[PDB]
Amino acid sequence: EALAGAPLDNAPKEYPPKIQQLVQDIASLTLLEISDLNELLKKTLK
Amino acid sequence: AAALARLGLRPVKQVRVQFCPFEKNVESTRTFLQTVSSEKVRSTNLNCSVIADVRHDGSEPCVDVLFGDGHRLIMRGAHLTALEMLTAFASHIRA
Amino acid sequence: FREVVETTIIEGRITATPKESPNPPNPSGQCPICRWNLKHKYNYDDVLLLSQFIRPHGGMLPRKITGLCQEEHRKIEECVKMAHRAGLLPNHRPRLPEGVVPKSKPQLNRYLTRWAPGSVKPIYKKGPRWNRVRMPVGSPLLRDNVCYSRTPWKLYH
Amino acid sequence: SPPSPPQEEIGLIRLLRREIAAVFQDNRMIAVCQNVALSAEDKLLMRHQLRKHKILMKVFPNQVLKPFLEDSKYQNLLPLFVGHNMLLVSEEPKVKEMVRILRTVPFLPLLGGCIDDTILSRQGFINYSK
Amino acid sequence: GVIRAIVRAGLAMPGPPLGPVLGQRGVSINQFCKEFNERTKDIKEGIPLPTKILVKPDRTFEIKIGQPTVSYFLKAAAGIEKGARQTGKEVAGLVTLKHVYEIARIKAQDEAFALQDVPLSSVVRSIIGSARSLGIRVVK
Amino acid sequence: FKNKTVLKKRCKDCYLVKRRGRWYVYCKTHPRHKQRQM
Amino acid sequence: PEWLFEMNLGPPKTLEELDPESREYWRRLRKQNIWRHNRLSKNK
Amino acid sequence: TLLPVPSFEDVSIPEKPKLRFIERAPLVPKVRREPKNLSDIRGPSTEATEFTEGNFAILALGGGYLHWGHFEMMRLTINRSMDPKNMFAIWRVPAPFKPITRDHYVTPVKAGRLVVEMGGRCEFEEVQGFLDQVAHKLPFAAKAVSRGTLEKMRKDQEERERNNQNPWTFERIATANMLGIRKVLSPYDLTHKGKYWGKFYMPKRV
RNA sequence: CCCAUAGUAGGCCUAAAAGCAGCCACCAAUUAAGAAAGCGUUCAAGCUCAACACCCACUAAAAAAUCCCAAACAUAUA
Ligand SMILES: [Mg+2]
Ligand SMILES: [Zn+2]
């Protein structure tokens, strides 16, 4: 499997399918799940 | 390169090489760059300025040559051999 | 085929590159001519064959480009030289500058001419019978050619 | 002609193959740059400049480089390797300093490269430096 | 033009060796010789100093002074003032590997020496090769 | 020119051409190197 | 520096002695080849 | 692609690596030992046809006589272009012993004879140059040969004999007296098999 | 075709031989250059070659005296 990156200079920032799935999951998840995610992120880095 | 070394780059003041490295039809122009950016040819005069402007966006390979006089030499090396380009360049310099 | 055009801007353009006939009679032939069973079966006369391996201005094409057998390359080279001298290729005349118009020259019909006409010196003193200076006719490279007549090619006259 | 008897790779070929793999996997920042015909003095001093800023220079023959990448993830870098080439290798992406010292000599083109397991062009390089 | 010499620091005027070449180029030999005086007095005296001088068309003087030759350092280490004639089975002096490393440490600091390599193992390998070229053998 | 049964290139710039039905060595750098096949 | 102790002496490692698939191995073989070339080119 | 270099460390060089001086005339004259009827120039050599403590040589491909001049030519040319440490030369022909009176001494050489030999820590190509030079300056036809080249030559001759498509050979016809051919042939031709004609030798004849 | 940094002008003899007046050793850094194979310098300085990349192709003689001396011809079935 190849990266196949930089298809064109004017390409409107195409994204891989893998980066898209996590975005949808976060939106569907409730704030309570997000609240624990934010707290753990704060613990790792600030 | 040796032929170009003998025939100094006196009239020309600026040379510019533009190519797309991902494109398959640039190798010739690249070879041309390799020949023009050597001490044997560059040390003939310091008036000459060699510029390499490599771009990613899909465009035809081309080299630009600026002379001291009104002479102006553009050539697209998409379907031109490096040797042919060098010979044409030398002939133009001879004037 | 590639054409270079100068209008100062120089471009290269690819035109229709002719292609080989669909099925050669002898595949797994190394030469182009070896394939068409044309090894010893062509002479200086055979301009259809010879015109294929020459540049528009009459010069021979390189061996690597055409993929000719070395032996066969040499044969075609000399055959084309003979073809030119016999006047069988009128459309492959040298690139003369427009300014230069060739002066009128005495015309002599010739064929099977090995040497360039300028280079040869006249045989003023032909030898005795036992050691005779003979006038070369045709190329020794074409000695291996198929001979229908019982008498082989008389290469020296 | 009868099929040409295959010859076992000269040891050097095998050794050369290993070095490329090691230097490529270890170093995050790889930069494909055309190996221009500079003077020995000039080449040494620019190499020293790179060494000061912790950037290493490597060249590998295309004869061995091409087979390595023809069956790999990084097959998109094959057109980059035509004619003279060199690899600017670094553990960390220190692009700003190499860019600024390349600015001195315009004839040298930065063809492209790969940073953090993703390919990038010179335009992308300058975007990443900014 | 770049001219390489191992003129001794102590002797100010080169005289015969550099006389014809400088004359051919047509540069002031007096200025050139007096330039060496500062460099001589800055460091230890009575030691040869290899220099790689650069001559420009405008007749300006560029002085690039390199560290003393490896030959003299190895001779000093062995304590011999004269190298072996045979350079074969004749060993004029014995130098410990420790002292070889010490001289290698204090050697690789200049671009004239050109050994800018990060591992000093390469440098010491060069020195041990040079020692073998001389009538010097290593121990320990 | 000097007549030679065997022709030898005397320097790098020497070059060997067949003209008028015989071999010649020509040399632009060293004109003395000029040779004619006999 | 431990590697000070770990080094070659007197006799240079012979081509047979030096292991293949090594950088120095090919350096020695190249060196010998240049020697061969120089020896042969003596009369030419 | 790099290739392994042959080692000649085992090879030893004699104390005198140069060709010794050859005298113009023998100190004491000697009578004929060989039969008078025999020609010393005609036919194949029966002696010194094989390499002895040497790798390279000058092979004679024709009969002839060597004067003192030829010896001097050989000696000077070989010694001048020799590296004494690397390579050594030995004479494979005796000093001129056969007198010619109109008095100068000559040595006979038959075809197949090795005139001079050479060995040491060197390849064929190194020595071939000056050896070929000397071979050309010899009266008879001669060429520089290695062990390998001589063996190849002999194998090629053998191969040509075996390979020949011609039903008729000189040997076959001569031995059987097939056209009454012995009338125009020498008795020596039976042994020579048509390869030798006078002092001259044809290598191209089977 | 292309290209050539450097441990060092490798040590002894030599006014000095510094790669190439001579003798011994012939290691060694880069990725890759022989303590240098051929020229050239009083000695230096320099031009090549082998070296790395680039992938290109690379396959041997003649003359003389009244006036040359058959005519000629490569292509229809031994
Ligand atoms: Mg080379
Ligand atoms: Zn010449």
Side-chain angles (χ1 to χ4, degrees), chain E residues 38-111:
Chain E
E38 289 81 16
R39 321 295 149 97
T40 304
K41 67 182 79 180
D42 289 343
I43 61 161
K44 279 79 73 181
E45 299 87 11
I47 184 155
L49 265 301
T51 179
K52 323 294 163 187
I53 61 142
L54 304 103
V55 182
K56 309 301 169 189
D58 64 313
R59 303 291 175 194
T60 192
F61 298 88
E62 279 80 4
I63 316 296
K64 173 68 193 71
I65 45 150
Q67 287 193 20
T69 190
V70 170
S71 296
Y72 192 83
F73 282 161
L74 280 169
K75 267 193 276 180
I80 57 155
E81 294 289 334
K82 197 85 175 179
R85 292 168 66 87
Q86 186 189 359
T87 78
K89 279 86 181 179
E90 186 193 342
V91 186
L94 267 299
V95 182
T96 183
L97 213 143
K98 289 184 83 181
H99 203 285
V100 173
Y101 181 73
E102 296 309 311
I103 64 152
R105 276 266 289 273
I106 67 150
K107 186 54 171 154
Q109 267 82 23
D110 59 312
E111 275 307 292

Side-chain angles (χ1 to χ4, degrees), chain G residues 29 33 39-40 43-44, chain H residues 2-3 123 125-126 130:
Chain G
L29 185 57
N33 277 126
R39 194 164 67 259
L40 262 311
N43 285 356
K44 281 82 202 164
Chain H
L2 296 156
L3 287 163
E123 290 91 346
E125 289 75 22
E126 170 57 24
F130 60 84

Side-chain angles (χ1 to χ4, degrees), chain B residues 32 75 81-94:
Chain B
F32 179 84
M75 58 178 82
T81 315
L83 179 68
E84 275 154 29
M85 291 176 85
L86 281 168
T87 51
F89 184 40
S91 66
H92 272 93
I93 295 162
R94 276 195 289 271

Side-chain angles (χ1 to χ4, degrees), chain D residues 15-59:
Chain D
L15 164 74
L16 232 298
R17 199 160 294 163
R18 272 183 269 98
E19 189 178 317
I20 297 167
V23 76
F24 188 80
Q25 290 314 110
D26 293 1
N27 294 157
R28 285 163 50 198
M29 195 272 280
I30 319 293
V32 182
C33 191
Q34 188 167 324
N35 191 11
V36 85
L38 270 164
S39 182
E41 292 83 32
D42 290 329
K43 203 160 279 178
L44 259 289
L45 65 87
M46 61 79 76
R47 192 171 184 182
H48 199 178
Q49 286 271 60
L50 289 163
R51 264 279 197 184
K52 284 180 195 77
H53 294 77
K54 201 259 191 176
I55 302 151
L56 303 173
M57 285 171 79
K58 301 289 180 290
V59 307

Side-chain angles (χ1 to χ4, degrees), chain B residues 46-76:
Chain B
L46 263 302
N47 296 313
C48 287
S49 62
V50 190
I51 303 163
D53 192 15
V54 58
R55 292 177 184 181
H56 184 70
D57 62 305
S59 64
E60 292 84 49
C62 192
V63 298
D64 296 10
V65 167
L66 265 299
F67 284 90
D69 64 347
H71 295 170
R72 181 77 175 90
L73 181 62
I74 45 163
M75 58 178 82
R76 292 180 183 97

Side-chain angles (χ1 to χ4, degrees), chain B residues 21 30 33-34 37 39 50 52, chain D residues 34 36-39 80 82 85 106:
Chain B
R30 282 195 54 174
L33 189 144
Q34 189 70 46
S37 47
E39 277 75 17
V50 190
Chain D
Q34 188 167 324
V36 85
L38 270 164
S39 182
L80 275 295
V82 285
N85 290 289

Side-chain angles (χ1 to χ4, degrees), chain H residues 191-204:
Chain H
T191 59
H192 296 334
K193 296 168 188 293
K195 292 175 173 77
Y196 299 86
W197 168 247
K199 57 167 198 151
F200 304 99
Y201 155 74
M202 286 72 77
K204 218 158 183 71

